[PDB]
Short mmCIF file of N, CA and C in Angstrom, two decimals:
data_model
loop_
_atom_site.label_atom_id
_atom_site.label_comp_id
_atom_site.label_asym_id
_atom_site.label_seq_id
_atom_site.Cartn_x
_atom_site.Cartn_y
_atom_site.Cartn_z
N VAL A 413 39.83 -51.34 79.09
CA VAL A 413 38.39 -51.63 78.85
C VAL A 413 37.70 -51.93 80.18
N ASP A 414 36.41 -51.60 80.26
CA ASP A 414 35.64 -51.83 81.48
C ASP A 414 34.14 -51.79 81.17
N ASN A 415 33.70 -50.69 80.56
CA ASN A 415 32.30 -50.51 80.19
C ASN A 415 32.20 -49.71 78.89
N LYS A 416 31.00 -49.67 78.32
CA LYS A 416 30.79 -48.92 77.07
C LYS A 416 30.63 -47.44 77.38
N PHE A 417 30.76 -47.10 78.65
CA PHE A 417 30.63 -45.73 79.11
C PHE A 417 31.57 -44.80 78.38
N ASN A 418 32.86 -45.13 78.43
CA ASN A 418 33.88 -44.29 77.83
C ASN A 418 33.60 -44.02 76.36
N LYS A 419 33.28 -45.06 75.61
CA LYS A 419 32.98 -44.91 74.19
C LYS A 419 31.78 -44.00 74.01
N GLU A 420 30.76 -44.20 74.83
CA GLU A 420 29.56 -43.37 74.75
C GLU A 420 29.89 -41.96 75.19
N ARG A 421 30.78 -41.89 76.18
CA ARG A 421 31.23 -40.64 76.76
C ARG A 421 32.18 -39.88 75.85
N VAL A 422 33.00 -40.57 75.07
CA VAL A 422 33.95 -39.88 74.18
C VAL A 422 33.17 -39.10 73.17
N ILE A 423 32.23 -39.81 72.61
CA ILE A 423 31.36 -39.29 71.61
C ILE A 423 30.56 -38.13 72.19
N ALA A 424 30.00 -38.39 73.36
CA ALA A 424 29.17 -37.42 74.06
C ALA A 424 29.96 -36.26 74.64
N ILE A 425 31.06 -36.54 75.34
CA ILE A 425 31.86 -35.48 75.91
C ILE A 425 32.37 -34.62 74.77
N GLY A 426 32.70 -35.29 73.68
CA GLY A 426 33.18 -34.63 72.50
C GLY A 426 32.07 -33.77 71.92
N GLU A 427 30.82 -34.28 71.99
CA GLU A 427 29.69 -33.52 71.49
C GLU A 427 29.40 -32.32 72.39
N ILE A 428 29.39 -32.59 73.69
CA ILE A 428 29.10 -31.58 74.69
C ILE A 428 30.22 -30.55 74.85
N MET A 429 31.46 -31.02 74.81
CA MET A 429 32.61 -30.13 74.96
C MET A 429 32.69 -29.15 73.77
N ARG A 430 32.04 -29.52 72.66
CA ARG A 430 32.01 -28.68 71.47
C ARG A 430 31.18 -27.43 71.71
N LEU A 431 30.11 -27.60 72.50
CA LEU A 431 29.18 -26.53 72.83
C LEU A 431 29.90 -25.24 73.23
N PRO A 432 29.92 -24.25 72.35
CA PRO A 432 30.61 -22.95 72.59
C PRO A 432 29.86 -22.00 73.53
N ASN A 433 28.59 -22.31 73.84
CA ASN A 433 27.82 -21.41 74.71
C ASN A 433 27.98 -21.76 76.17
N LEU A 434 27.57 -22.97 76.51
CA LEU A 434 27.62 -23.47 77.88
C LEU A 434 28.88 -23.08 78.62
N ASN A 435 28.73 -22.96 79.93
CA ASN A 435 29.85 -22.68 80.80
C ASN A 435 30.49 -24.01 81.09
N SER A 436 31.76 -23.99 81.43
CA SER A 436 32.46 -25.23 81.69
C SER A 436 31.68 -26.10 82.67
N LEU A 437 31.01 -25.48 83.64
CA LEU A 437 30.24 -26.24 84.61
C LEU A 437 29.13 -27.00 83.93
N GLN A 438 28.39 -26.33 83.05
CA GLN A 438 27.32 -27.00 82.33
C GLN A 438 27.92 -28.04 81.43
N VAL A 439 28.99 -27.64 80.77
CA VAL A 439 29.72 -28.50 79.88
C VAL A 439 30.15 -29.73 80.66
N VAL A 440 30.62 -29.47 81.86
CA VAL A 440 31.05 -30.52 82.78
C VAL A 440 29.86 -31.26 83.36
N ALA A 441 28.80 -30.50 83.57
CA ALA A 441 27.56 -31.02 84.12
C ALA A 441 27.13 -32.18 83.27
N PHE A 442 27.37 -32.01 81.99
CA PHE A 442 27.06 -33.01 81.05
C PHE A 442 28.02 -34.14 81.18
N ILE A 443 29.31 -33.83 81.42
CA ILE A 443 30.27 -34.92 81.58
C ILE A 443 29.74 -35.80 82.70
N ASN A 444 29.20 -35.11 83.71
CA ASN A 444 28.64 -35.76 84.87
C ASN A 444 27.37 -36.54 84.54
N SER A 445 26.55 -36.00 83.64
CA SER A 445 25.32 -36.67 83.27
C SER A 445 25.63 -37.97 82.52
N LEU A 446 26.71 -37.97 81.74
CA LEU A 446 27.08 -39.17 80.95
C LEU A 446 27.33 -40.36 81.87
N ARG A 447 28.07 -40.14 82.95
CA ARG A 447 28.36 -41.22 83.90
C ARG A 447 27.12 -41.55 84.71
N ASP A 448 26.33 -40.51 84.99
CA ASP A 448 25.08 -40.69 85.70
C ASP A 448 24.13 -41.47 84.82
N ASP A 449 24.43 -41.46 83.51
CA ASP A 449 23.61 -42.16 82.53
C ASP A 449 24.27 -42.14 81.14
N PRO A 450 25.03 -43.16 80.80
CA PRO A 450 25.71 -43.24 79.47
C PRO A 450 24.70 -43.50 78.35
N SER A 451 23.63 -44.21 78.70
CA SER A 451 22.57 -44.51 77.74
C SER A 451 21.93 -43.21 77.28
N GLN A 452 21.91 -42.24 78.20
CA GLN A 452 21.35 -40.93 77.91
C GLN A 452 22.43 -39.96 77.46
N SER A 453 23.66 -40.46 77.27
CA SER A 453 24.75 -39.60 76.82
C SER A 453 24.32 -38.93 75.53
N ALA A 454 23.52 -39.67 74.75
CA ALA A 454 22.97 -39.19 73.49
C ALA A 454 21.93 -38.10 73.71
N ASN A 455 21.16 -38.24 74.78
CA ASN A 455 20.14 -37.28 75.14
C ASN A 455 20.78 -36.04 75.70
N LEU A 456 21.88 -36.29 76.38
CA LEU A 456 22.59 -35.25 77.08
C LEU A 456 23.16 -34.22 76.17
N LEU A 457 23.72 -34.60 75.03
CA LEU A 457 24.18 -33.55 74.11
C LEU A 457 22.92 -32.90 73.59
N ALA A 458 21.86 -33.71 73.49
CA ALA A 458 20.58 -33.20 73.02
C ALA A 458 20.14 -32.09 73.96
N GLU A 459 20.32 -32.37 75.24
CA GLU A 459 20.02 -31.45 76.30
C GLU A 459 21.00 -30.30 76.23
N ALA A 460 22.26 -30.69 76.12
CA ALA A 460 23.37 -29.77 76.05
C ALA A 460 23.23 -28.83 74.87
N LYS A 461 22.91 -29.40 73.72
CA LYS A 461 22.71 -28.60 72.52
C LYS A 461 21.52 -27.68 72.76
N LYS A 462 20.53 -28.19 73.51
CA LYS A 462 19.37 -27.39 73.87
C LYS A 462 19.79 -26.33 74.89
N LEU A 463 20.72 -26.72 75.75
CA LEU A 463 21.26 -25.85 76.80
C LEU A 463 22.11 -24.76 76.19
N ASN A 464 22.92 -25.18 75.23
CA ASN A 464 23.83 -24.31 74.52
C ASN A 464 23.03 -23.22 73.85
N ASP A 465 21.98 -23.67 73.18
CA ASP A 465 21.08 -22.79 72.49
C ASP A 465 20.21 -21.99 73.46
N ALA A 466 19.78 -22.66 74.54
CA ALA A 466 18.88 -22.04 75.53
C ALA A 466 19.54 -21.01 76.42
N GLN A 467 20.76 -21.30 76.85
CA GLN A 467 21.45 -20.40 77.74
C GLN A 467 22.11 -19.30 76.98
N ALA A 468 22.84 -19.71 75.94
CA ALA A 468 23.61 -18.78 75.14
C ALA A 468 24.31 -17.78 76.08
N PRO A 469 25.19 -18.28 76.94
CA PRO A 469 25.89 -17.45 77.95
C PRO A 469 26.95 -16.54 77.32
N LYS A 470 26.52 -15.35 76.92
CA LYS A 470 27.42 -14.38 76.30
C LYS A 470 28.32 -13.72 77.35
#
Protein backbone atom coordinates (compact mmCIF):
# COMPACT_ATOMS: atom_id res chain seq x y z
CA VAL A 1 0.00 0.00 0.00
CA ASP A 2 1.11 3.58 -0.68
CA ASN A 3 -1.55 5.60 -2.51
CA LYS A 4 -5.02 5.18 -4.02
CA PHE A 5 -3.30 5.45 -7.38
CA ASN A 6 -2.99 1.72 -7.96
CA LYS A 7 -6.64 1.07 -7.13
CA GLU A 8 -7.69 3.92 -9.40
CA ARG A 9 -5.16 2.69 -11.93
CA VAL A 10 -6.24 -0.98 -11.81
CA ILE A 11 -9.71 0.01 -12.64
CA ALA A 12 -8.53 2.53 -15.18
CA ILE A 13 -5.67 0.54 -16.71
CA GLY A 14 -8.13 -2.29 -16.88
CA GLU A 15 -10.62 0.04 -18.58
CA ILE A 16 -8.03 1.48 -20.94
CA MET A 17 -6.22 -1.80 -21.65
CA ARG A 18 -9.62 -3.14 -22.78
CA LEU A 19 -9.69 -0.60 -25.62
CA PRO A 20 -9.29 -2.80 -28.77
CA ASN A 21 -8.66 0.18 -31.09
CA LEU A 22 -5.90 2.23 -29.49
CA ASN A 23 -2.30 1.38 -30.13
CA SER A 24 -0.31 0.10 -27.20
CA LEU A 25 1.30 3.55 -27.01
CA GLN A 26 -2.04 5.26 -26.63
CA VAL A 27 -3.14 2.47 -24.39
CA VAL A 28 0.06 3.06 -22.48
CA ALA A 29 -0.31 6.79 -22.87
CA PHE A 30 -3.26 6.36 -20.70
CA ILE A 31 -1.33 4.27 -18.24
CA ASN A 32 0.88 7.31 -18.13
CA SER A 33 -2.04 9.71 -17.76
CA LEU A 34 -3.29 7.77 -14.70
CA ARG A 35 -0.07 8.43 -12.78
CA ASP A 36 0.05 11.93 -14.19
CA ASP A 37 -3.43 12.18 -12.70
CA PRO A 38 -5.22 9.28 -10.87
CA SER A 39 -8.16 11.56 -10.10
CA GLN A 40 -8.59 11.84 -13.85
CA SER A 41 -8.04 8.09 -14.30
CA ALA A 42 -11.81 8.09 -14.69
CA ASN A 43 -11.62 10.81 -17.33
CA LEU A 44 -8.80 9.05 -19.01
CA LEU A 45 -10.76 5.97 -19.99
CA ALA A 46 -13.35 8.53 -20.96
CA GLU A 47 -10.69 10.03 -23.16
CA ALA A 48 -9.41 6.61 -24.06
CA LYS A 49 -12.87 5.38 -24.93
CA LYS A 50 -13.17 8.58 -26.96
CA LEU A 51 -9.72 7.84 -28.39
CA ASN A 52 -10.61 4.25 -29.09
CA ASP A 53 -13.67 5.39 -30.91
CA ALA A 54 -11.95 8.45 -32.44
CA GLN A 55 -8.83 6.79 -33.75
CA ALA A 56 -10.20 3.40 -34.58
CA PRO A 57 -6.66 2.32 -35.71
CA LYS A 58 -7.47 -0.45 -38.19
